[PDB]
DNA sequence: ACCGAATGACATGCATGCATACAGGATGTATATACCTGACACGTGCCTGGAGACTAGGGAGTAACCCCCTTGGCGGTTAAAACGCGGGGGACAGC
DNA sequence: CCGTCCCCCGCGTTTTAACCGCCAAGGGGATTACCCCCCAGTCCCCAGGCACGTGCCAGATATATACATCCCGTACGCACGCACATCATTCGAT
């Protein structure tokens, strides 16, 4: 009894919504406390610049974004519409950032 | 009968042993007219960097060095032929 | 110059990031000059596949 | 071969499946509206690095020679290419 | 999963054109020799640029509303099958 939209359509809304913006995507603040978890074994009490840490976020995410990009021809170049892991282990192996 | 645009000297058995080196298959009746394409953009590159400097440096001979080099400029250094 | 024309043409008369991917991507000779890097706070291009559509 | 009565055939009604245009309904989006202000664009020093003039001497552009190695040509074999085809299994489509 | 069919492929002719080997010439790479004009370098001088504040501005940021869009149900068409009566045909006597 209650509206309901199809499946898929509201995706679609979004790939519209979010292709449009510029913000970030990832939370802010679990995404420091990433970097200071991973960077902890390269040095000890290192300090970031608050500058650059958001310096990685527009870094990493610009990266993130032209891979789930490249594997959506993938899939699609696979009949199928969603993306799996397999095809990305294809994606990165072109580019040579795997193998 | 050779006057022809040699572009088809690049022959369709030839195509099909890179392939092979490649690792492939089962090579489809149409690739060999793509990949008469590639090779031409491909080539379009790399010579047009090596006349120029040979255009600059007032020699009339493309040289070994002067493909070297502009192989260099494309991210696939070419070891070998000099350097 | 390009960039300028673009914000223009979405109403806004100052140049912000968002305005000045649309004049590098866009504009396929400069694409090609930078095409490895990635302008920060950019966004990206507006494009869903064909196939991706709905299936009216 | 037609009347006579029964019956398969011819034509249709009936009912339904299906398609579908749409309107309703809701949702969402775009608009034009207010308010607000970090944050732009000069302004104003204020200074050091760009500009003027000066010499000085390599470093590049000249001419002038050479030679080598590229391009040209030119007969021979023979290897690889161009061509046919026979058929199967790899794509393709559908459920 | 079923199953389809065609379209590449081996494999076999036969045309050829790379392949070499050699011959020939000089264009032209490469090198020497000269020299000048040309950039480095110093000194001096100065306005062009950066730092600092400043406000104002419009630029942004939020509102509310009109409008557009999607989706389901709907009914409506419609061609359908089913089903019928009737048009038509057949078996018997005429």
Do not use: W
Request: glycine share 6%.
């Amino acid at each position: 009894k209650p509206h309901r939209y199809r499946p898929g359509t509201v995706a679609l809304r979004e790939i519209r919504r979010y292709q449009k913006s510029t913000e970030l995507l990832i939370r802010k603040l679990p995404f420091q406390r990433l970097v200071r978890e991973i960077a902890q074994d390269f040095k000890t009490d290192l300090r970031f610049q608050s500058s650059a840490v958001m310096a990685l976020q527009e870094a990493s995410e610009a990266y993130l974004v032209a891979l789930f990009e490249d594997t959506n021809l993938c899939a699609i170049h696979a009949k199928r519409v969603t993306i799996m892991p397999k095809d990305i282990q294809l994606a990165r192996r072109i580019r040579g950032e795997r193998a | 009968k050779v006057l022809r645009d040699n572009i088809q000297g690049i022959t369709k058995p030839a195509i099909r042993r890179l392939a092979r080196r490649g690792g492939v298959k089962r090579i489809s009746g149409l690739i060999y007219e793509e990949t008469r394409g590639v090779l031409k953009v491909f080539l379009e590159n790399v010579i047009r960097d090596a006349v120029t400097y040979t255009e600059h440096a007032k020699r009339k001979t493309v040289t070994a060095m002067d493909v070297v080099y502009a192989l260099k400029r494309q991210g696939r250094t070419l070891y070998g032929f000099g350097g | 110059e390009l960039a300028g024309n673009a914000a223009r043409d979405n109403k806004k008369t100052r140049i912000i990031p968002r305005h000045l991917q649309l004049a590098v991507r866009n504009d396929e000779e400069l694409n090609k000059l930078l095409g490895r890097v990635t302008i920060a706070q950019g966004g990206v291009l507006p494009n869903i596949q064909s196939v991706l559509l709905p299936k009216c």
